[PDB]
Symmetry: D2
Subunit: 201 residues, 4 copies
């Protein structure tokens, strides 16, 4: 198909004890697969709509496409943004580190803003550190669901899934503990690479 | 001076009779100007929040940022996507044209899908032709307001403002006439340029 | 059909000079009629879905129903909430007046909160004075489009349409002047009646 | 003390094995409690705004009010809509039953439409059976989050929480099993009571 489910770059239990393998399996094998399948279906439906010149369901198809594709993009980024603690360094280094100090003042400032954005979401959503092509800067955005509350052209660098399915089985309603534990498995090397390729657009 | 109001690449009345000069003036000078100020203000507010370590209004600020920055991005592309009748080819050619035929079957099919997405919006929004970096293809998206119903990483190639302020003074409630008339001023050279640079991401 | 387009309780030009007859005609005859037709169509589609046991388009149909029915409800209330200046009294009287002083402090306080809610909307929307059945109080709500940002059970008492089609032809981008002029045509007798029948639920 | 957390009309484990006591406890004690506090806080904030004549955060406060108050309303109806298996009739009777057959053809048709609306939600939301005062009929609505996709004046009769926290601990990703199991604890006497009082509006 057009979209395919990427494999995890590590074992399902590699992120423990911070993130359980039980969540990783359901999150990847079930939820992410669903978005991939939904994005492919939306495209097939759009294709049939053009062939028959019937765009009656255009509003539905465009939302299906945006919702599912955004879900695929967000999760694909999410998997690579993590790595077992000890494998990747903590705290941004070199160019990324400097850029963070430039646009946020310091790493602690960025972390606090990102955390506030993650825990304050009213509904399902994401906390996202993106590259703004227009302002040539790094900003934090609070996505609603998967596809709402973000400017076009935004390039994701670091994302934290705040949908309840991402943490409920282990942290229950305490989203704060989930965010705190998550900081331990952030793969700053992946975010650094994304930043390198992002700022050239 | 992080965000600035770009000047129109043509005179306010250069798009007539398709889009009146009265609309171009109010649209650029008043509306677009507002989103630039709002985007700048949101960043200043976020910087103040970090300085005082008070992220109590993070939800408001993240939406102020997304809404205004997206408005700024969308209108910035919109102005360049247009040019006086006779300035550029009335139909895509070369790689852009071949890509359109590849992802939509034909130029007419693309126009039909884009038009349906533009006229069907339930509320304020945009019809948008974007480059999908993940699927490596061109898709049409239907934005709600300025910042909703789109995947992160979407590169805008061609956009049509469907907010009522974009056409009400001239076309009133007849959205169909506005869209049909708009096709006459589309600058395919701009779109082709955006496509060339998008594919290299 | 199930839903019908209500006739205006006054001539199209009765609200002048505050609201032009040109806007009243388009707003009522075109925009409102569209919501009535759309709500009826949504119900017919839902009926067919049940007959054939095909709920594939349920997400589309539920949004179509909510969007259009909310549009019908909001506009129906909107027409009755207005009357030619001099016909209806200015400032709430008796029970309504007391309730407003109780839940807002004073009439000026309510008017200021309502005005701020009306002019600050980021996209299409409504400023609404509703009766809260659960808290047994009058609150101001800011609707997005027609059907978003409101609790179920909310009973509208006074509504102000902030969609651009409601004021653009006369006030252009200056929504502030539109709200200020609108206060002159509010039919406080209609709001009083709605309040009388609302607080018994 | 404007908004208060209602107590469950039954023990936390009274709905087992359909809905676990663990979920009922967290759902009522933690989640519902949060919306009550948020709704109270929003009103206090709005009162403070009026006192100081500063409505700068009106957009944030109106959403805080709508989101939290709607969460409060939705969960308040939800608890009462349920009762231990064997407490009430497993199928609507009398006027409620006749009304369901009138507006949906049959009870099974209603269940099918309600179920489709519940399982198809793209994000957090609610499946809801409401009384439409304008059309004088019973419709099914699909709420997004707590406060989106619904017309003002909608009277909630029966509601099903589709937020992940409502079923993830027990049913994981299998939404279909949660909905099917939920039908077994629906208190039709409560719904019938709400219908009787709704029709008298
Ligand atoms: Mn997820
Ligand atoms: Mn515009
Ligand atoms: Mn209107
Ligand atoms: Mn809940």
């Amino acid at each position: 198909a057009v979209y395919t489910l990427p494999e995890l770059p590590y074992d399902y239990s590699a992120l423990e004890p911070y993130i359980s393998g039980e969540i990783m399996e359901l999150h990847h094998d079930k939820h992410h697969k669903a978005y991939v399948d939904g994005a492919n279906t939306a495209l097939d439906k759009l294709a049939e709509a053009r062939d028959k010149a019937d765009f009656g369901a255009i509003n539905k198809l465009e939302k299906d496409l945006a919702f599912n594709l955004a879900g695929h993009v967000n999760h694909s980024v999410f998997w690579k943004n993590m790595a077992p603690k000890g494998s990747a360094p903590e705290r941004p280094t070199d160019e990324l580190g400097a850029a963070i100090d430039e646009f946020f003042g310091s790493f602690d400032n960025m972390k606090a803003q990102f955390t506030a954005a993650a825990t304050g979401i009213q509904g399902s959503g994401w906390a996202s550190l993106v590259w703004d092509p227009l302002g040539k800067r790094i900003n934090t955005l609070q996505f609603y669901d998967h596809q709402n509350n973000l400017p076009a052209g935004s390039i994701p660098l670091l994302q934290l899934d705040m949908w309840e399915h991402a943490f409920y089985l282990q942290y229950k309603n305490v989203k704060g503990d989930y965010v705190k534990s998550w900081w331990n498995v952030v793969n700053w090397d992946d975010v650094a690479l994304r930043f390198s390729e992002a700022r050239v657009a």
